[model samples]
Target: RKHIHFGVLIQGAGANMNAWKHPSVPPDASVNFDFYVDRARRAENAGIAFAFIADSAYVTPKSAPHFLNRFEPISLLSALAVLTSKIGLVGTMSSSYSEPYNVARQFASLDLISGGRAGWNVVTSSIEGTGKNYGRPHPDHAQRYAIAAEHLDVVQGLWDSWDDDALVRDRATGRFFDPDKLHRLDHRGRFFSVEGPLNIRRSPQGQPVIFQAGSSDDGIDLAGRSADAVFSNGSTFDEARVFYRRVKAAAAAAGRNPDHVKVFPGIGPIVGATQQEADDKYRQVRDLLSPREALAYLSHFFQQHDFSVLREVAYEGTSEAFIGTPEAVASEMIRWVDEGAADGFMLGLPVTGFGLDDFVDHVLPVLSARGYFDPVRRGATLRDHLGLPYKESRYA
Candidate 1:
């Protein structure tokens, strides 16, 4: 078995300003659906395990104004489902702004449409301005996670409302489904009242794989109880190991199988033909950064500290945080696994489409050769790719 699984973050609507200005990249690719389609197909071809589309309900933090423009993730993923055959189609959907039944149904529909290649990245919408978009006031972070937990519980209940054999489709008796086999979830909770026997049947993977990415306390707690994977943002090997062990222990304490929840840190690999070339590529992307925007972006990740304070402590060896050549980066990642840090990583691309292309071209081969990464089989679904056994019930 491979120790690491590869996933790509698809940049559909816009690339970072620095990425958009790259010499070999096309400026108009952001708005072009064909661009995304091509990228998805390329990822599938490259033996990547999954392609995730990160989403936001509304743009906030005025520093990155360009975040506002994008195609809705559900619609985009639904479309992409028809185009790709195997790579997981993951989308970020906010529980704060959505109803559980609808989310459950949408994911089931997508999974059916894609033949068992759907995953959900559940998030509690936190951008303050998102409330305005939803015609409500913003709730604090703690309350948001609370609501998200309830939302996930209700969604999973709704998904389990119908058993696989409920659909008989018997032409002899003209019976399409067994009413007695159907379950009704009349779930009334603090956040929702969902009387659901979801309109759609269970997906091929039973329930779409659940992924969570928040690093906060409540976030980790929610993920520990439910998520199949936690999308992590550990800047260093030590941080990644600490987080991985903590979350797994939390899951075990919550009566969940600790091994069931995989921890994948967020990584951005800049690859080239040679180590020096890769270093040069990293510098080129870093040099394109607008210092003000970069600092502002860092503020969100390293909360409770001023960006200026973080910049003051410059350490050696790729900051032991982020930014480095493929070899150094891969070595650091392998060290994390050796130290019991994480199972894998969800890589961030420095450039839009080209970053994935580069990593696939130059870095993946190195990892595969070292037995860290596995080459995906031609028709493996997301569950197979992630090493998760096929589940028959959403509750599991």
Candidate 2:
């Protein structure tokens, strides 16, 4: 009904291989708390709705080359709690490696600490290497998602264990809590056994807004069933549209409101003072990439050929793999929305802070002026920003 809102993913671990190489970006951003603080402050100032921090249980070959080392996201977000007053803080955690009670407690605590501005990005920990880190041989993709679904059910049950008005802290009566208000989620599932009421009360936003980012069929099903927002990687309008419809349909089939789950595709926009300047900047980053590395990285998602082999395929047609130019990028994104492909976009930057700076300085205003971007108020909790209702207690 309303224009879609934009979210700026902090990408603190540095998703881009050459992000650290940018002249304007700090090379040690992932390890440097101060660097992230500065970035968060700037994003807040620029009217970003939320700042997301992605987590990786184990580094994959695709992310091994540069700036892959970093601190854990939950800890990092907790540190950020004191630095800013409002912008929504999202931290990713894997269901495959964590228990529902632990995750529910951590996120609930984080929401309280941040004064209700917290979010959890649900990931199933699909990479094979991550299992080794957790002392498992390996679990297949479907099994991981199944675990994630059951894990989420337990977390939600625990959160709803106490009603909003469960706590009656009466000093005269010396009664802090009402036993009738407490709910115990004695959940036993195929993958996990969690009993409780979580140690922490219900989060300010009911349960921190559940966000999901995965493009596989299993991923789609999981997001449709539980996520408030779906993060996708579609390089073209058609691809994004397809994902949007698919996820929405899945949501409908799952008996959830389709509108409740927002679909956002990842886009990389290189903005400059002029068209020529933007093109130059784009080429500069492309040149900095080692073709060998790019090809190797592409193989993870593409899986069809080596970089050398893909080189021979010719890049004349429009595809979801790549796009360039701010206007072109904006137009394509608009096309997707027009075609009912997505609600909004999550922009990725090739050069970390600098690329984001360019987009905010040059592109955000354009999008806002064009009625595509809606700047959210500062200090709003992630749920408040997303227009989701907050519950004081989950047990009731």
User: Candidate 1's C-alpha lDDT?
Assistant: 0.75
Q: Which candidate is the best by lDDT?
A: 1
Model 2 — which ten-residue stretch has the worst lDDT?
A: 313-322
Per-residue lDDT over 1-396 for candidate 1, one digit per residue giving the tens place of the 0 to 100 score: 455876777765223455667765566555567878988887788788788988776665462423546677778889988988888999999888887888998898888898888999998765667788878865655588878888998888888887888889999999999888788888888889988888887767777899998687877888898899898876677777778878998899899888789888877766665667777876777666666656766776677356665443221013433345667666776776667877877766767566777767766777778889876655556888888878787433
Stretches > 4 Å off in candidate 1: 13-17, 60-66, 290-327, 394-396
For each candidate in turn, the TM-score is 0.89, 0.88
In the range 1-396, model 2's lDDT, one tens digit per residue, is 346666777765345656666667676776878888888887787777678887676675446533257778788888988898788888888888887888888888888888788888888765567788778866665587888889888888877776766788999999999888888888877888877867777656767888898688988988988898989876666677788988999899999889888887776677665667777776776656667766765665676566574542322111322245556656665677777977876656666677777767766666677787666573358877766566455333
Give candidate 1's error at residue 150 in angstroms. Answer: 1.0
RMSD of model 1 against the true structure: 3.8
Query: Cα lDDT for residue 29, model 2?
Result: 70
Clash counts for the predictions, in order: 1, 10
Stretches of candidate 2 off by over 4 Å are: 60-67, 291-329, 391-396
Local lDDT at 326 for model 1: 63
